[PDB]
Write a structure and sequence with these properties.
Six copies of one chain form a homohexamer.
Chain A lengths: L3 H12 L2 H15 L17 H4 L3 H19 L8 H13 L7 H16 L5 H19 L3
Helix pairs in contact in A: 1-4, 1-7, 2-4, 2-6, 5-7, 6-7
Bound molecules: protoporphyrin IX containing FE (6 copies).
Chain lengths: ~150, ~150, ~150, ~150, ~150, ~150
């Protein structure tokens, strides 16, 4: 894939500061779909507002985990089947905790939003399409699990 | 069930003032999912904002009805099969008016939110888990209807 | 004042259920001006969302207090100078806790909103103007205090 | 259908200024379901806020297209099978771009909202029911496509 | 002023469709400051949500009036003292209806937002600064009135 | 001051990760007062949504600056007059860019919110009061400038 280098080059920016960038992704996600806020429950409490999630060490650690799994997809962008079973197992964990398959698009839109805002003019049409394809391949792998 | 007493003890607080507590539950529900606001249409009009629903006698009467059905679940917590057909009939009514099965989780999260906020430190881990199980049993009964 | 009976007649509806109606007024107030939410701090904690305030016994008791002071204005609508010093003392308490004079209009708009929604077609033009005048007279009395 | 004239008479108001009215419909749609905002992507960019969509010529042109297709349904209200294949083809296009069948209700609620707000007292019970039936027939035609 | 041509050239875009552009400005204004929504009251009713304002013929006519007064400022950009008394009289009307001097900045930010979104890359730094200066001169003229 | 150690001890938590904590403070600030979003304009563009600010390197650098100035107040908590002229000069800069004195309370509430959420049960009554006093002393110093 020639778009493998578009993904690698565009991820370098974000990968140097994964929590700041992941913070944009989750801020966007809760602005688009605040009904996902209750899925993140730590110490038996529900976040009242999206800004409450940003004060939780557990939640910020969850952001870091998400960013490491996207980073792994980037590392394996030229295949992606090297991570197939890890992603199917990650999908099984999602279904277990009550996440719906239909919510995948909103997370993808939040990731694309975060990339658009970080790269500016460098988030070219080809770069956008390459990320949509990567994300789609990741979600397909995770979808085996429902 | 030993958690039957956790449910009964925790419901006494809320059951003494069902409209105030139900008001928290619906306020939370519309904050998490404002797309449910149009399902409550009285006198051929749509609520523009969540606060509009709180001014409607019909809507507040709907809150009271919801709270009485949760109260009935509490009264029958040691079985729950005593209410099985009433709940299946309630499920049929829901499908009829356009409510989706997928919205059950958001209502459950709103109920758990209302209980967390009312009980504070008394909403222990065991109490939380007991309510999730009760609510799950109620939704399972209602789900026969779609 | 002939509008004294418009105020008395229109207040009877609301006065029979002061917490439900006051709940609409404060729900509207926080929807219009969420920056007022932090002024209501009980047990050293800030409400994260407007729906959090509706779960607080202290806050609901504050609503009841507000509704009793509007009720007192209605009781004294034919004069209003009978309550002048009580209202000036209430104004002093407001300035003390950090409330700004400029926020009076938003509270007035929330009260008028609550009355419009409760009375429907009975909230005639004359009724609206009578309430605006009463509220203005109340705020003038309270404004001595800043 | 006798409600054919209720639909025609009520549409004349809106049809004279299709962009202003369509603007209400989409403003309502994004207020109820902001997660639909990312589906409208032009020039490789995502709208950050609903008000951003109203500044986009492409988006306003999309509103005009939607309003012309509702207008065509009105023109063919006495049958509706004259437009069956056009609507099935429109449904296929929707599935292609990632729109879910479940989102149809929210668009219907936004259309009914726009009609209620435009007609006021002229949006009688019979008029409301006639539009719900028309919209339902349109969505049924479009649903063949998923 | 050499920035007189930057203002004239940038206004031509917007002036051809004043209601669509004014709609962006007011949508932005209510998103930034929803407490201004109650100031626009027609037929003795308050808008519950910003989208309600967009359904009101009176409100859309108010948008057109605002856009004509900005257009007049553009027409007189090389002086602006030709409109001094009209603007002072407009300021007096504002104070009368309860608008605060402090709200001028938010309206200016909404206008600049609308211009940024309409012009894109054509809303250069010099164009931005020229509009800020024009708007400031308009508000100074209107401020005599409080 | 004995509350000097309450401030120092409570700041250690936050001072180790100033951007994450500052991010909570600004997220809260924009949730309470979205009309402050346009004051942060970089590269001649306005943030459409609060989440847009979190993607801006300039804005995140502004957060770091704010956190360093609060850190300086903590370092000088036993006097605070050691920073008097720096703070008066910072106040002059604020007035210059259009910030209002009245917005100080909302920033203080956002800071207290961030501290409450970071410390949990360690944000005792005495700790809360100590921070309110420090913040008040800072704002008093900055207020010379308007
Ligand atoms: C369908 C949309 C999604 C939703 C609603 C969702 C939500 C969640 C939730 C609620 C958790 C558990 C939180 C906790 O208990 O700490 C979680 C875990 C996680 N998510 Fe997602 N998620 C979605 C998609 C994704 C995607 C697309 C990825 C990246 C490939 C991802 C990466 C992760 C990771 C790495 C974890 C930690 C799993 C573990 O505990 O081993 N998620 N997600
Ligand atoms: C799936 C999530 C739900 C949604 C979206 C929903 C929505 C609705 C709606 C729109 C109505 C009709 C309103 C009216 O016309 O007055 C209704 C009725 C009602 N709901 Fe729900 N509901 C949900 C779940 C529940 C649950 C979990 C309970 C409690 C077990 C419940 C209790 C009731 C009751 C008691 C009624 C009145 C039924 C009757 O007319 O006989 N609902 N609900
Ligand atoms: C200017 C707009 C207003 C704001 C921001 C405001 C806010 C507040 C706050 C923050 C409190 C103290 C809460 C507590 O510690 O429990 C309070 C108390 C109160 N307010 Fe207001 N208020 C406003 C106007 C009014 C008006 C117009 C009335 C009715 C005439 C009113 C009636 C009351 C009453 C009766 C109390 C309780 C006072 C006491 O402790 O003795 N307020 N208000
Ligand atoms: C299920 C709810 C719906 C959603 C989420 C939705 C969303 C969309 C989207 C994302 C597009 C493409 C935008 C673009 O690329 O410019 C579109 C196109 C369109 N929609 Fe919808 N839509 C829905 C239902 C409807 C309905 C009920 C109608 C009217 C019958 C309608 C009329 C149209 C038309 C006429 C187009 C242009 C199609 C073309 O490119 O040929 N949509 N819609
Ligand atoms: C300070 C911020 C402002 C606020 C809160 C505000 C609000 C209002 C309100 C509430 C009205 C009366 C609505 C009605 O009854 O129909 C009005 C009228 C109007 N405004 Fe503003 N406005 C502001 C600034 C401006 C600016 C900067 C301009 C353009 C120079 C402007 C142009 C107009 C015009 C032309 C009218 C119609 C006046 C008339 O009745 O003769 N406004 N405004
Ligand atoms: C009154 C409420 C406040 C508002 C609305 C406000 C807003 C702003 C704005 C708009 C800027 C300039 C942004 C830029 O161009 O990058 C700024 C700068 C700054 N603010 Fe605030 N601010 C407030 C209070 C405070 C407080 C209480 C502190 C901490 C003591 C603070 C610390 C700073 C610092 C350190 C800077 C950078 C100044 C420089 O350029 O030298 N601000 N603030």
């Amino acid at each position: 894939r020639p778009e493998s280098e578009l993904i690698r080059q565009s991820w370098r920016v974000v990968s140097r500061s994964p929590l700041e960038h992941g913070t944009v992704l989750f801020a966007r996600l809760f602005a688009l779909e605040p009904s996902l806020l209750p899925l993140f429950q730590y110490n038996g409490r529900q976040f009242s507002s999206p800004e409450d999630s940003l004060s939780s060490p557990e939640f910020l650690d969850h952001i870091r985990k998400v960013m490491l799994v996207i980073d792994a997809a980037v590392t394996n962008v030229e295949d992606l089947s090297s991570l197939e079973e890890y992603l199917t197992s990650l999908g099984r964990k999602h279904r277990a905790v009550g996440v719906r398959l239909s919510s995948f698009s909103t997370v993808g839109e939040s990731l694309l939003y975060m990339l658009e805002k970080s790269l500016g003019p460098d988030f070219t049409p080809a770069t956008r399409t390459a990320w949509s394809r990567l994300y789609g391949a990741v979600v397909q792998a995770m979808s085996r699990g429902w």
